[PDB]
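Colleagues,

Please find the record for the two-part complex below.
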Amino acid sequence: MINANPGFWNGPFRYLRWSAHNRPHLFFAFAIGIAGPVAALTLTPLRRKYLYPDHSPLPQSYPLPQRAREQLTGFDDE
Amino acid sequence: INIYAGGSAAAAPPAGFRIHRPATWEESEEGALSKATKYFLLAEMFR
């Protein structure tokens, strides 16, 4: 018919133009969904190197020291 | 001038009666992103 499918394997770019013209509701959904994982893979190390690094983690619990006990004084009874 | 067989010079079709052709997605003088924006932001609706 007037604007049928030319096939992804018979010209990718021509298929992408056809889809943006006749089926935007899928094309821009694919573009949205591909723009996240791909940018996360590619842009993240740039942001870590040049803009700012990754934050130091939060405590999450009492930070029990990795040592042995020390004998103290002060504040005793009496 | 002309002799007609089961017809007339009135019933002869208008000169341009044959509509040109439906345009396809190619031969569209409006880029895909323009009509995409009008498709997703509902232009004529807001108007």
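The first helix of chain A runs from residue 12 to 22.

Comments are welcome before we finalize the supplementary table.
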